[PDB]
Amino acid sequence: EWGFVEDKEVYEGVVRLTKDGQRLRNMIMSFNADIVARTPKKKPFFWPEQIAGFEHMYDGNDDYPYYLLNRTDENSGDLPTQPLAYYENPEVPQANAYMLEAATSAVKEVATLGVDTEAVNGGQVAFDTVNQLNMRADLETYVFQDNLATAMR
Amino acid sequence: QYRGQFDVVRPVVRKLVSEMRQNPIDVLYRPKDGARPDAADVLMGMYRTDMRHNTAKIAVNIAVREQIEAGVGAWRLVTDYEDQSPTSNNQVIRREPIHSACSHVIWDSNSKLMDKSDARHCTVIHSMSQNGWEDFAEKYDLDADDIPSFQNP
Amino acid sequence: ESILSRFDADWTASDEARREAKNDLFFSRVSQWDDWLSQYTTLQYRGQFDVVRPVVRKLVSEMRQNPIDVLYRPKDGARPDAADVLMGMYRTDMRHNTAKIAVNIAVREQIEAGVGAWRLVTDYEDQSPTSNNQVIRREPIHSACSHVIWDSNSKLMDKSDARHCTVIHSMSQNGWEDFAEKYDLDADDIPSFQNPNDWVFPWLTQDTIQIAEFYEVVEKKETAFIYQDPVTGEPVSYFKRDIKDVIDDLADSGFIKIAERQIKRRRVYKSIITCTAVLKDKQLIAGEHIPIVPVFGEWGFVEDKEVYEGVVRLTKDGQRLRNMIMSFNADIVARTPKKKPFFWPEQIAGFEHMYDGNDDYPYYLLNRTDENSGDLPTQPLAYYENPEVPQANAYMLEAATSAVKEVATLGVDTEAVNGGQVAFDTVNQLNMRADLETYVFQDNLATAMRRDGEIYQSIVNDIYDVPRNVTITLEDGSEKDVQLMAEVVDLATGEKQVLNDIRGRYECYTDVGPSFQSMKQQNRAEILELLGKTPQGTPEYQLLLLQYFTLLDGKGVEMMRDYANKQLIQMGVKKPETPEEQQWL
Amino acid sequence: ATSAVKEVATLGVDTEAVNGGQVAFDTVNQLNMRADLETYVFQDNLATAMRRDGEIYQSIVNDIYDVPRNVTITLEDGSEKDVQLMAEVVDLATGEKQVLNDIRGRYECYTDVGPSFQSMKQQNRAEILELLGKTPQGTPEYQLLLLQYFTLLDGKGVEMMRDYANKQLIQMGVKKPETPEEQQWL
Amino acid sequence: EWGFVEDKEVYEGVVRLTKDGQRLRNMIMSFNADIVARTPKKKPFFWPEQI
Amino acid sequence: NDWVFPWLTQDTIQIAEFYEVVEKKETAFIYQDPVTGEPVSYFKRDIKDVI
């Protein structure tokens, strides 16, 4: 089942509809599986002197006190500085909502074929009419070419 | 990185494969009144006295899936005229569809529908099958070094 | 290089692991052990995820639709053997396992994993000769196809090619005493195979000592009726034909040859495949009927071998995120020493015993008295964090809700038909009844003869040669009782082992198809409605008199067989099997 | 996390009525019964016979008859003569054999595997999971029901199938009870 | 009647999902029971000059 | 017994008796020489079909 105008017969098909259309799914893969390399590396930064200590810090030994801090700082005076923001966030979760919904809608479209309550001259479709008989490609029982016959004895 | 999880498009056509239940469409050789019905003595045994237990009814479906997947072809036959101990009329024909091997096959002849005589037989090609190679025993067996050269896909 | 045959052509298969291990072997493992492969730095405390199994099991149990019970199939073409007394073909079949249930443990994994059948001892195992019938069949055991890659496969189940391909079980030890039933073998067959250890040998199992048994391998036998000519003395007189007639008969003219199925023979030299090792010294076992039926499925791929079907890979990386959220959550509670109570403990931790009793109203630790700094307030009521509550992963997986389950997709419909029976019913019924190789007419051991013709009565045939007259039953008689009044004791035609071909030897009728047939199934199975198809009538009830008996094989109810059959009189309905009731005058 | 526990406890989720929930685990049952019988009845070496399969002493009653002269038969009339278990002439061929050995009697009588119900007039009376009253009726369908609701066989008062049927109604003859002797007159 | 892998094998139970299937419910247990003893007296404190 | 574990009970007091382990019984009466050598005149059977 192929339609054509140009000498290369082009298919007519279903699954090729949404191929790149639903790459909208891979945009969750383009964030958490790929550009997640932005990894938080969250540092509370206020008074650990210089950040490089001995290995005890991130191994979590039974010795509790985390104090690294002592301050006599650079000369400016009467002014703060606020690190608060830190690193990054998840990406603006709005505009991505309807894309997947449209793809899935086009998907529930292909689940509608000859839809009936039930029965009432049921669900025969194009593919049945074309696929019904290879028995009629097997139609041959000496139907035109007759050779074999009973011939009692 | 980590890819090959996508898939998930399948189920849309999984509804289209399952209609096979009604694919049989049972009907058996309705006679006419213009021929001789008195010769019908053998007719009542057509599905019986020759081929009775028949697996090939599933072989239709093997073509049914690949159909929506891709084009549907046809393949080799072993003559149904067989065995020993001759018997009565006993004729029905068979064909068992295989899976694909039509991929790079290129046909330009007619390729619409064939009820009647038409083009006889033209082109059959398979790439990297095995099948009846070492089974040459009963056909010709002279040399068979011919083996044309193609650009393999 | 002639004798060696296919193994050198089969080395490209078993050379090394390549891609047919990592990709394929996921077929049967998904239900077991774990998922992740390449991703670096995987962490601990969850060692068995499952999160596959719920997919397959229930739907594997959704294939149970296949009783398909219709039996004792009568032959409609001509007389089947023995008729009324032969009903017992299914005798030993229905009692234990086989097609009724054991197909459960037999088929097992097909769509999820590789499928097939496994070993057997001899063929027909029952000892004692007797009058009854017998049916015995396969009893495979354990899951030996994982690493198996066996190639001769281009086609189908029923193919006429080399039968059952090749037979090897991966490793067998108990079997050491199982094949001990042969004659005094040196017991060391010492095969050398390479099962890749990557030279560090992670697993230590050393099992060896494997054999293979057969005699006729790919026995090639065709019609080939006397095709050759004596003139010119051509070599290679090996016979060939397609259709018997062609040239028709040159016989009555000339060319008398007349040799029938006696050949001093050469056979194909593929032998117990190996380079330098062969034995082939006087062993004979039956012939290859081989009722053992390994089954092999069908799905899409270029050609030759395949990466076969599985449905679970949609979820595998939907699984990974349920495992990775424990990488984003359970770890940070361990990364947090929970609260560090320092706002101006200038003296750090002194007086440790103030942590003894953990009450101590006078906490202190606080004085100021320091260098020049200035007042710089701090508000870590949020501590220092950029907290992200998992809002993204939730919806990322909400589109994957049904797709992370993605199964049990079948059997969805209102009611009745258009239901949950897909090709797998007819494909696994192809795992059941579709084998053409078993059939009936096979003649090997003595199951073959029924009456046998007695192999005697020729010597007694002289009675019809007696002179004077020949007369049928006369002169009454009284004590006769049972039938078979015997003087001539003569039959016709002949009785032998088999019936030849397509006469009398047929096996099983119809195909996959209706569950209703011609024997008295009306009875107790109707789910919704009941009756109204055949209401009352005056002849109707004398029609339904003989119908409704459900007996099959009963005991107390058997007087049915009497009926009115004493005197046929005005009814004379069935004209039945046994003359013994009806023959009195 | 709740969605994990819902998965494992589900076996054959179904609505109601037909299309039941039988699993392979149900078949452990007759794997256990077969784990009994074929470990017992598949070997009978000694005791099947009650006393040595008749003790083979009684054969001595054969003493005078096989002599070629005439043998006494044809009881003159008789009324109460019909009672079971008497021995005078004792016309019988050979005798029963113990264990298994040569001829038939070795291995017999096992269950018919299938749905829940059985038949000793049972899946006749099954009904249950599919509606009710599936029995059709007709005018002489009550001669099928001259058996009526009789069900449990050997019971004391369901025994009506025998005594009530034992004499006067024998003009019918559809019955076949277990009763030993009868005959005699009216 | 179960599946198989090799030889005879570690037994597959329905409890293989239930091992950690309870998961982190227990984490809400972490904040309450005995760990108030770890916390030294939630201190309501201000302007307490009593020296 | 993992020798570090405090658990008390050690002694057992009970046993069992083997019977058949790889013990082969054979009948195998047929098919060997009547008179001349009688070497290995008794051995197991393969096919039951016919001589």
Residue numbers in the entry:
A (entry chain I): 306 to 458
B (entry chain I): 52 to 204
C (entry chain H): 9 to 593
D (entry chain G): 408 to 593
E (entry chain G): 306 to 356
F (entry chain G): 205 to 255
Source paper text:
Procapsids are built by multiple copies of coat and scaffolding protein polymerized into an icosahedral shell that incorporates one dodecameric portal protein at a special 5-fold vertex. Portal protein forms a channel for bidirectional passage of viral DNA, which can move in and out of the virus head and provides an attachment point for the tail apparatus in tailed bacteriophages. Packaging of viral genomes inside procapsids is powered by an ATP-dependent motor that assembles at the portal vertex. In P22, this motor consists of a large (L-) and small (S-) terminase subunit assembled in an oligomeric complex.
In this paper, we describe an immature conformation of the portal protein found in the P22 procapsid, before genome packaging, that we named PC-portal. Nonetheless, we obtained small crystals of PC-portal protein core that yielded complete diffraction data to 3.30 Å resolution using a micro-focused X-ray beam. Instead, a phasing model generated from the cryo-EM density of PC-portal protein was sufficient to obtain initial phases and build an atomic model that after several cycles of manual building was refined to an Rwork/free of ∼29.5/31.5%, at 3.30 Å resolution. During refinement, it became apparent that PC-portal is profoundly asymmetric: the portal oligomer, which crystallizes in a tetragonal space group with a whole dodecamer in the asymmetric unit, could be refined only by gradually relaxing non-crystallographic symmetry (NCS) restraints that were omitted in the final stages of refinement. Second, the 12 subunits of PC-portal occupy non-identical positions with respect to the 12-fold symmetry axis running along the centre of the oligomer. This asymmetry is particularly evident at the bottom of the DNA-channel, where the 12 subunits generated a quasi-5-fold surface. The PC-portal protein is less compact, having a noticeable increase in external diameter from 170 to ∼200 Å. Despite an increase in outer dimension, the diameter of the DNA channel decreases in the PC-portal from ∼40 Å to ∼25 Å, which is close to the diameter of hydrated double stranded DNA (dsDNA). In PC-portal protein, the trigger-loop is locked in an open conformation, possibly by making contacts with scaffolding protein5, while the hammer-loop rests folded preventing barrel extension and narrowing the DNA-binding channel to >25 Å. By pull-down assay, L-terminase associated with PC-portal protein (lane 9) but not with MV-portal (lane 9), suggesting only the procapsid intermediate of portal is competent for DNA-packaging.
